[PDB]
Structure 1
Amino acid sequence: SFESKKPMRTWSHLAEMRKKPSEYDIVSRKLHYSTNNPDSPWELSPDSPMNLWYKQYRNASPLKHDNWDAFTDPDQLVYRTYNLMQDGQESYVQSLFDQFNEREHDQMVREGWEHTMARCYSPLRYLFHCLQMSSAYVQQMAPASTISNCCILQTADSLRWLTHTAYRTHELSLTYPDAGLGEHERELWEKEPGWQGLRELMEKQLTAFDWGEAFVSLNLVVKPMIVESIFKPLQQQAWENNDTLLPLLIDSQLKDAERHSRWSKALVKHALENPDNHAVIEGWIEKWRPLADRAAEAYLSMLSS
């Protein structure tokens, strides 16, 4: 029998909130319907290939929680506010490019710095694209839309960094046409020893298909390692070589990185509400840390030589 019920002030799933649903709540929460039916994530044959993939790599993950949808981005970003924020930051970066170019900044760098950039900076486009691809993977596998949304924005941020790197590689090559800038990055990513630790780490991370292990390895191991052992040391080196643009550029990128850290730590906190998860997360961290450390070491020694 069907009762009469009044209109609700918000979605049925939010109607029990005490607080007035925010823009973020209204547009972000509980959107993955593919988690509703354990036997059939997607509305197809229960054993269709993508159904088997999700049952194995999402549903069966050792990282477990009875309410992933309750996760909340501490920054509560939606598409609209992300673009407002990033238009501000990217507009500022583009203005730095413009003004520093007017002042012929690149001609004033210390002798040979173009060679260090060509070796240690421009091939970063491969690394950042790996982070982009990987962020996209976590997005599609994550068991809650509020989690996936952080991953979408993270994927876009990775492309942002990739684009910064592409623009600056080309620009630098205009002042320094004989350093391989824009020409040899692929060879360096494939063959140069300083890049081999990073490339091995990403190739393997990109084949960690469990959503939980993908998340932990990408965001808790790889990305913090890139902050401490790549971004920061590059700023230090730039200072010593009279590159005053790169430190400012990296500071903008570091804002994105710190935001990724914020949602990541927020998810961990939500995940630790289940005691079993502590061991699951530590084990993945322990498993991936060696490769990360080796990646950082190879990179730093290539940088300091």
Structure 2
Amino acid sequence: ALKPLKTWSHLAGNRRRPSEYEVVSTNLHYFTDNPERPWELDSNLPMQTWYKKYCFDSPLKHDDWNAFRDPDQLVYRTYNLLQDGQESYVQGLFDQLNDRGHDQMLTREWVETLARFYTPARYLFHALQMGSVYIHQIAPASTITNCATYETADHLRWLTHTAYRTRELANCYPDVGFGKRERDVWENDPAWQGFRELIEKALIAWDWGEAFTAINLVTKPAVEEALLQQLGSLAQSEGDTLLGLLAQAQKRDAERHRRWSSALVKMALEKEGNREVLQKWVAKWEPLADKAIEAYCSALPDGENAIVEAKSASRYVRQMMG
């Protein structure tokens, strides 16, 4: 008879007793057991073909993708511990800054800036959500998927903040069109077309590795520097303390997405040729990001400096991974 083990069989050679994270997150996808027939059906089904093309045939390659480890070690249980604290903080701000009539103290000019540059953030944030939720479903290993899982929820977190603040702004300034106008702005405002083009295109990059790259390494850096870093400094300087705070709060999430993305890249660089594969994808996408940041920030106050600082801050994210 086979003897009972100390831990799961797939983890039995380890030396350190496995963590809760290792126990509940590792080696869970089963469609990678049979590369020739991922799913327990006919091998010519469209979805069979999709996974073979966009997951197995990716030029980003590793012998053991299951070895990946979220450096933050998130599980569902500790995801909700963390984000519940963070949400008590942000809903704290909403509750208390309202009580105090914060939206009433903003200038007419700044209110006009919010309709054009902020509210209209619900489409881009929902599009990141769709973006990360695609990485989840095509990534080659459950630990990679999970990072995308929790990231997808953060992106919905941001969309949710924005939708909430949008209604508060519509309550306080009914004649501005908050909540009614955002689609036309996203669709037609020059300031947004740079981003819209970047995200629409990235959203049809099906290769798991190119998806990771376009969404996590290229687009998000650009979106985070433009919308969180740059609009938030501007907010703080213009009397909007809520948004200055809200944005720094969401940037905690963005930071954590970067830590896992950087870990992934670190792991990819273990294998000859992956840096070049990654650099080639970056080179294809970076120009779209440039356009995106240019069109958005150039229309901000102090437009040119915000372009320079965002450009170099988002390139810095990738520089630091190699």
Which residue of 2 is the match for residue 84 of structure 1? Answer: 81
* Aligned-residue identity in percent: 61
Deviations 1:124-144 (A, max 9, x none): 100000000010000000000
Counterpart residue number, 1:71: 68
Which residue number corresponds to residue 238 of structure 1? 235
**Residue 318 of structure 2: aligned partner:** none
**Deviation readout 1:167-198 (Å, 9 max, x if unpaired):** 00110111111111111000011111111111
Q: 1:273 aligns with which of 270, 275, 285?
A: 270
Query: Partner amino acid for 1:57?
Result: Y
Larger mean Cα displacement after TM superposition, 139-148 or 239-248: 239-248
SS at match of 2:44: coil
Q: Distance in 1 between matches of 2:108 and 2:52?
A: 56
AA at the equivalent of 1:180: G
Which secondary structure does the structure 2 equivalent of 1:75 belong to? coil
Task: State how far apart, in whole Å, the 2-side matches of 1:298 and 1:212 are.
Answer: 27
2:141 to 133, 140, 144: 144
Distance across 1 between alignment mates of 2:284 and 2:93: 41
CA distance in 2, matches of 1:92, 1:117: 22
TM-score, with normalisation over the residues of structure 2? 0.92
Letter in 2 for 1:247: G
Offset of residue 242 of structure 1: 0.4
1:251 alignment counterpart: 248
| Aligned mate of 1:264, from 261, 265, 271 | 261
Amino acid at match of 2:290: D
Render the CA deviation track for 1:73-111: whole Å, top value 9, x for unaligned. Answer: 000000000000000001110011000000000111233
> Cα deviations across residues 190-248 of structure 1 (Å, max 9, x unaligned)?
11111111111111000000000000110000111122222111112112210011111
Q: 2:24 aligns with which of 20, 23, 27?
A: 27
Structure 2 residue aligned with 1:17: 14
Give 2:224's match in structure 1, choosing from 224, 227, 236: 227
Residue 127 of structure 2 is aligned to residue 130 of structure 1: yes
**CA RMSD after TM alignment:** 0.9
Letter in 2 for 1:150: C
8 Å Cα contact 1:120-1:302 kept in structure 2: no
Can you give the 5+ residue segments of structure 1 that lack an aligned partner in the other structure? none
| Separation (CA, whole Å) in 2 of partners of 1:175 and 1:160 | 23
Match of 2:95 among 86, 93, 98: 98
Q: How many residues are aligned here?
A: 302
Matched, 1:293 2:261: no
Q: Distance in 2 between matches of 1:23 and 1:294?
A: 43
8 Å contact 1:230–1:296 — kept in the other structure? no
What is residue 313 of structure 2 aligned with on the other side?
Answer: none
Please list the CA deviations of residues 9-52 of structure 1 after superposition, one character each: whole Å capped at 9, or x if unmatched. Answer: 11110111111111000100000011111101111111111000
Instruction: Tell me which moved more, 202-211 or 239-248.
Output: 239-248
Equivalent position of 1:169 in the other structure: 166
Indicate conservation of the 8 Å contact 2:66/2:143, yes or no.
yes
Q: Distance in 1 between matches of 2:22 and 2:77?
A: 14
Query: Distance in 1 between the 2:12 and 2:129 partners?
Result: 36
Contact 1:73 1:266 (C-alpha < 8 Å) held by counterparts: yes
**TM superposition score normalised by structure 1:** 0.97
Choose from 25, 49, 52 the match for 1:52: 49
Counterpart position of 2:214? 217
Q: 2:310 corresponds to which residue?
A: none
Residue 89 of structure 1 aligns with an amino acid whose one-letter code is Q
Structure 1 residue corresponding to 2:58, chosen from 54, 61, 66: 61
- Name the amino acid aligned to 1:5: L
2:281 maps to which residue?
284
Q: What is the identity, as a one-letter code, of the residue corresponding to 1:164?
A: H
Unmatched tracts of structure 2, length 5 or more: 304-322
Answer whether contact 1:230 1:300 (CA < 8 A) is retained. Answer: no
User: Is this contact kept in 1: 2:229–2:248, CA < 8 A?
Assistant: no
**Which position in structure 2 is the counterpart of 1:7?**
4
- Name the CA distance, whole Å, in 2 between partners of 1:118 and 1:111: 11
Runs of 4+ in 1 over 2 A off after TM superposition: 302-305
- Rounded to whole Å, the distance in 1 between the matches of 2:153 and 2:236 is 28
Q: What is the CA-CA distance between 1:303 and the residue it aligns to?
A: 2.4
